């Protein structure tokens, strides 16, 4: 049972621009991913504070990096606070007609993609170097779902019988084949440590056989 969705006009828009804008510097995918991770970490934390069983689905607060370069995949994991159905359709969690608006005034007044994240749309940013993107998300409250897109002003949302996943929520960069820099291992490093030193929570490359 797949559901297929109409991206709002604003964010069709958002994504178009950063698919066809000429802009070298699309390094900062990751750090935008990792900061909607962290984000995330920080939702289902502070709900643990007055509710520990919020962590019965993971106590393990992480983000794991995951390039498979046979897939040409890299795969962002957090077991932050996850996303509900509802959530997904509604632009991942986002204000993202907002937050568009704010955006694309600021580019036209000095911005450049890289300040994306200020305006709350950094998910985004994936269409930089991937030319689909799968969202695999489980919140406390719902079900296990996946939301998938290749840009071209769809989405798809199906439940998920893939691997359970507790809670948290997984990014799948289907990499576009020019962009199979961000499956090396050094390459990856160099960019974590310069943009997301500072990420409170542990962030684990995984290395491939
Ligand atoms: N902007 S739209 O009229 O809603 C639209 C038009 C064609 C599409 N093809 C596709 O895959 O999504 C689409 C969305």
């Known amino acids: 049972e797949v559901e297929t969705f109409a991206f709002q006009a604003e964010i069709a828009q958002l994504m178009s621009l950063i698919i066809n804008t000429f802009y070298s510097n699309k390094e900062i995918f990751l750090r935008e991913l990792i900061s909607n991770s962290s984000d995330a970490l920080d939702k289902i934390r502070y709900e643990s504070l007055?509710?520990?069983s919020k962590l019965d689905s993971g106590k393990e607060l992480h983000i794991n990096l995951i390039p498979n370069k046979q897939d040409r995949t890299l795969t962002i994991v957090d077991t932050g606070i996850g996303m509900?159905?509802?959530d997904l359709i509604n632009n991942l969690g986002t204000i993202a007609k907002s937050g568009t608006k704010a955006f694309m005034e600021a580019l036209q007044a000095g911005a450049?993609?890289?300040?994306i994240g200020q305006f709350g749309v950094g998910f985004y940013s994936a269409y930089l170097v991937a030319e689909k993107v799968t969202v695999i998300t489980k919140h406390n409250d719902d079900?296990?779902?996946?939301?998938?897109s290749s840009a071209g002003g769809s989405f798809t949302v199906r439940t998920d019988t893939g691997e359970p996943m507790g809670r948290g929520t997984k990014v799948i960069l289907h990499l576009k084949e020019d962009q199979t820099e961000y499956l090396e291992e050094r390459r990856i490093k160099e960019i974590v440590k310069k943009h997301s030193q500072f990420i409170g929570y542990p962030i684990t490359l995984f290395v491939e056989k």
Do not use: G
């Open 143 to 148: 079900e296990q779902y996946a939301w998938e």
């Open 84 to 86: 509900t159905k509802a």
């Open 50 to 52: 007055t509710d520990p």
């Open 112 to 115: 450049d993609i890289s300040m």
